[PDB]
Structure formats: structure tokens, C-alpha cells
Amino acid sequence: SSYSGPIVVDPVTRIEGHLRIEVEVENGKVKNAYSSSTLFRGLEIILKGRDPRDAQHFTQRTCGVCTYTHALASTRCVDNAVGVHIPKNATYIRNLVLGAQYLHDHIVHFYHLHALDFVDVTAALKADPAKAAKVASSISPRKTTAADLKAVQDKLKTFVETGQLGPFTNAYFLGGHPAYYLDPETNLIATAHYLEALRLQVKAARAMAVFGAKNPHTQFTVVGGVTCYDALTPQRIAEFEALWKETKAFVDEVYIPDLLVVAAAYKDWTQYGGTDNFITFGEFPKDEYDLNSRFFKPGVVFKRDFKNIKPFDKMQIEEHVRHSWYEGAEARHPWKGQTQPKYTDLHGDDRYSWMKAPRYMGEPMETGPLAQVLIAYSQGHPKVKAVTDAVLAKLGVGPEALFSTLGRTAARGIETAVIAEYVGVMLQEYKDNIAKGDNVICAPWEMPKQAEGVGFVNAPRGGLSHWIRIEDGKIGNFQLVVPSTWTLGPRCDKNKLSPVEASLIGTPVADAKRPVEILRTVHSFDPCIACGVH
Amino acid sequence: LMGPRRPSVVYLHNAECTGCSESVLRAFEPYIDTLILDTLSLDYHETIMAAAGDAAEAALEQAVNSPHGFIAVVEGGIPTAANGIYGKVANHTMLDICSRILPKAQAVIAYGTCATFGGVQAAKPNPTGAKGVNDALKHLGVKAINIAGCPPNPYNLVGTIVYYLKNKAAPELDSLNRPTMFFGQTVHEQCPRLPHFDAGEFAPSFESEEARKGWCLYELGCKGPVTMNNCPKIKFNQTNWPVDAGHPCIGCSEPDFWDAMTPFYQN
Ligand code: SF4
């Protein structure tokens, strides 16, 4: 029954943006892969000549999934270029909004983007809700009853019997699928939590708007700090804190237990989707000018050598275009970046994506939760170690298991749990700082006629950097190098496969018409194509 | 994916950041689960649908050719430069996809300043020749209801859909084809800082005591006076909106605002 031949997945759904994945399969296993990003917008071109203060408003529209993150990166970049040191409270407020973004983003990724690769929603109808409730209650301090799950089952039953399956139309699990393993009861628990997560995420996102005006696309940052004097009030802090507390409870009581039950059922997925090299920029600074002041620290790892973490040197980044739809073949450091579109169609002149191919010391680097977690762990981060160790003990696997599709999925949860607790620490520090009588949230600054700046964010998908060259007080060059660009960009001029391409080699494909195994690995990177290409 | 019973919605993603899709997920009373289970049938949506690839393409064709009819909700501008190649889905240009599908819709809603007016990728110098839906597809007689903002208030999408389902017609539309029930007033005439505006009480900087005290943000660039939206009334996420967070309006529900309203910190 084993398939040899191509498979194309276009569109890849349950990602942000427009991705085409192409693979070559031989005897039922992926032998070759191409990551093709098929929308270009050209925000870097549009920014040229504009006021540097305007950049964050444009670049935030790089992505509405990882909303805020680009406004924060551009504002850090312009803050850096003009040499302003923002007030402690601006750092706290920016950091808190970012922590809230991570919780929202990862919860929606696991349930609403990733889980339909592993959960058969229609098999939930066959479940025994009483058995299901016992299972749910055994994995979480939250008690679930048979009646609770029967309500979900009854709602789903009515939906399915209507014949209008909506988002479930033509799903790869319909009719059953050999790569779908869960029993009906676990399908029912996951489906109940999927639905619950649709309303919880409203609260998670609202936490960002308490300080940040609105979600999506916050509007509280400025060069020099933040604008939201109301964020100092006890009422707004309490409102934030209540949403955070409810969000964290969902992470701890619903998301992580579900993540572990699914991972235990798919333990074969420790064997696929590994990568060699990792990069991370660190996040949640005490000092805006010192990455090593961040709660997660930057670092670089080659060939899984975590005993030899290398410092991150921002000058070792170059973005390749040889296999991308841009002019020529010359890789550029982003302070010398070029964005010169030139389309050749799929594989025309060996080019197949609108993403550039970032390389660090010439190597392809995974970024995102697995990089942040593994590097933190290896740096001795006590909270990351405690949660990672508990997850591995629960799953009964060794650390080697993390180098996989399952491992990266688990790392996204680990980071969610760690950040959810750390938001409480930042909140307390913020409260303490106000109580000392510091009510300042914005600092004055002056625009230089000529400057260079860079801003670093570790976003939910990894290391984000915005790079500016100011000339005559305007934007002379503005380059974004985004986490999905690293992970899902194409080959470079040394023909090295990018992390997603390389990770797909060896993927089994049970049914080429329904290649859910490809989706499991691709989705585990949490692709953001609007981000990767901009 | 549909048949009778709930009205079918086909949701298309062109040149977009997915912020408009995310805004719909923030729907409140009704929430998005009620909308997808009870009110509507969401028959194609690349961000959340289970099918991918050929299976997704099949679901789309099934929805578009249904004898029951469908409503199209469109996010993102259409890149038209170089015969549409800057944006493709399933190796078709977005221009071709929309040209084929939207004339078949019973009604079209352009959701998003990008879909309504061209948006961020249409800002100068518009390398991809991005256009709003009605501009790009004028020649095919497509007249989408425009729900503007970056992203819009999801209250405005649900209110328009509910109206449409009730009345079987679009609501009163302004000269930019936006419903007057939501876009009939400037942000400014609804703003709590208007008394300071009237008094010439402007914050001269974000760090100033005047800003701390909530004075008017006009001198810091506020585009509220020239922007039609219901932000101060409905707010976002049931809790806040840009000026109440201390930041000027950047005009985001207006056509061409990336070029017309910039520099964002000047008036
Ligand atoms: S209107 Fe704004 S939020 Fe919506 S897709 Fe366009 S850039 Fe994104």
C-alpha cells in the first residue's frame, strides 16, 4: 500500500498565511521537501522614506496572530536607534502585554490549529461520557462530570446530524484514518476543551487590551515607553490580574494535561521531525540594552551540542535569496538588507518561495519554543528545568525525545506554563515599583539624523529582529528577520535545507490523499507566513 | 459542508495579516462557538478548517457551488501587479480566485481595511498592486459591504451579518459602502477627551503631565476628527480603545490611511 511519488499540500490550513508544502515520497516515507511561501506584501519596501516613529504601526500589520510582537520589535528597534532608555514601568507594561500574548497564542495554537491533526472530533460522538469524565478528572485537579461532557456530545451530535460539518468538512479523520490513534473518550475530552478554549481565549486576549487598548493590534507603545497612564491604576491592574489568573488556570488545568494525554498516545512521534541547530534571542528584559538581563537568555546551539551553547552574535545573521523570488543570489546582513522581488514561478531557476533564507554562521536554525526551552534548560533556568523534567517524567521518556515533532509540541506547552507563572512575578514587581512612587511610563528622546538600530523580541514562534538604518531622520533601510523566516524559509546558497524541510525527511505517510503526518510536523513549528515573508 | 438549515459562509484570505480573522474570534455575546454552531455554517476558512490541500480545495468548490447559496466574507487586499502573481493559493492567483468566486456569492462582505480599501500592502509604493475588493472587481459588478478598520470591531461584522440574515438586504451604507449604523459618527465626536479639545487643552508629549491627566491627543497626531468608526462607543475586548490607552487614533478605518494619516504623530 506504500506510496512513492509527490505530494503537494496547498493550502496548508491551520497556520497563519499562505504556505505550499511539496514532498517527494518513496516507499511511504518522505525523501525530500520544499517549503513554499506564496504571498508577498513588501512591507520593507513600503517603509522606505517614512518617519521612523511610524514603523511600528506598519510592521505590527506583519501579523495579527502574533499581534503586538512586531510593534514591540520596531519600538525596541527605534528606541535603540535614538538611544532612549525607557522607564522601568514601560518595560514592565510592555513585558506583561507580551507574556499575555504568549498565553493567548499558544493556547489557540494547540487547540484551534494543531489539535485537529490528532483529534477525531466525530469519534467523540461514540464516546461514553461517564468514562470520559473519569479520565478527564484523573489528569487534572479540575473535576469534570459525565453530564458536563454529555452536554458537549449533545451539541456536537446536533451539529453533525445537520450534515453541515463546517470547519470539519473533508477532514482527514472522517471515516477513520490509520494515523489517528485516540479512543472516543479522549477525543471527547479534547473536543470539549477545544470548545472551551474558544471562549477562554477571549479572556486571554482581553488581558492585552487592558493595558494595550485593543486586541488584535495593540496601540499603547511609543518611542520612549508607553502611553497608557490608566495602566498604573489599581483598577486596571486588578482587571489584568483576574484575566491572567483565569488564563493561567486554563493552561495548568486544561492545556497541559491535554497535551500530555495526547503526547502519551502518540509517543511514536518522538521519532520524527527533529532538527540540528537552534537559535533564541531571550525575552522579558530588566535592561532593554542587555539581552542577558532577560528572564530567558539568548543563545545558539549547533548539532544539538547543548553543553557548548554559543553566544548570540547579531552580526552572524545573513539572509539568502538564491532559492527565493528576489534578485540575484547574494546573502545580506539585515543592516545591508535588500528586498528586490523577482518572481520565477515554482522552481523557476531553483527558486520556490517569497521567504528569504536566514542563516547563522551559514547554518539553518530552528527557532521558537523548542529552541527557547532547550537553551534555557541548558543554561540552568530553574523554572524551565522543573517543568521540562516533570513533563519528561510524566511521559516516561528521556531528553532525546524532545528533538522531534512531539518534543516541539511539548516545548510549546512547557513555555506556556513557565511564562504563565512568570507573568505573576512581573506583575508583582510592577506593583512594587508603583508602590515605591515611580509613576513614570514615558521618557523624552530626540531623533538623530543618522543612526543604526536593532530591536530583539523572542516572539511565540522565536527570535524576531527589526533592523533600521536612519538617514536624514527618515527610514533609509528597514529589515524584518522573523522567526518563521528562519524556520520555514527555503534553502540557502549552500543548498542547505531549512529546519522545516529537513525535519520532514523520514515522515511516514499512511495515506497520500490525507497526509496528516506532514501536517503534524509542519504545524508543530507553528508557521506564520505573513510573518515569514512580510 | 453545508446544505439547508444554517446560512453558508465562505471566508477568503487574500493579502492579509490574519488580524481580521483573529478579531472575529474575539466575538462576544454572541461568542464564536455560538456563531459557528448555531448562527452560521463556516464552510471554508483556511485558519481553522480541518481539511488541507486538495481536500480543502474540494470543500471550497462544494460550498461555492451549493444550490443553497453562500455569503462571502473576504479578508485582505487583492494583489493585481504582474498578473496577480504576488499572492496565490493552490497555485491560483488571488485575483483569479476572487474573480471566480465572489460574483457567485449572494452577498459579499469586505472585512478589513485591506479588503475594503487595499490596506497596508497598498500603501506607497504598492509594489504588489494591491487593491480593495470593490476596486479590483468593479468590472465584475461585485459590490461588497465594506466593514473597515485594522482590524474592524467584530461587533460590526456580526451586526451586519445578523441584519442581512434578518432583512435579506444590506443596511444603509455610506459613500464608502460602510454601514452607517456603525460608521456614521467620527471617533472624535464620541471621544471622552472632546471637552479638552474644545478648550484647546492638548498634551504636548506622551511623558507630559497633560497626557497623564488625559488631555486631548490632537497635537500628538490623533486622527479621531477625520475617522469614522464606533470605537469609543463599543470599545474593544469589552474594555478599552486607543485614546483611553493614551494613544492617538491612527485613522485605521479610512481608505489609504497609511498614506493619508501619516506621519501618525503629526496633525
Ligand atoms: S485590515 Fe489590518 S488587521 Fe485586517 S488583514 Fe489588513 S492589515 Fe491585517
Ligand code: SF4
Ligand atoms: S483625543 Fe483624538 S478623538 Fe479625542 S478629542 Fe482629542 S482629537 Fe478628538
Ligand code: F3S
Ligand atoms: S486607530 Fe482604528 S481602532 Fe478605532 S480609535 Fe482609531 S479607528
Ligand SMILES: [Mg+2]
Ligand atoms: Mg525581511
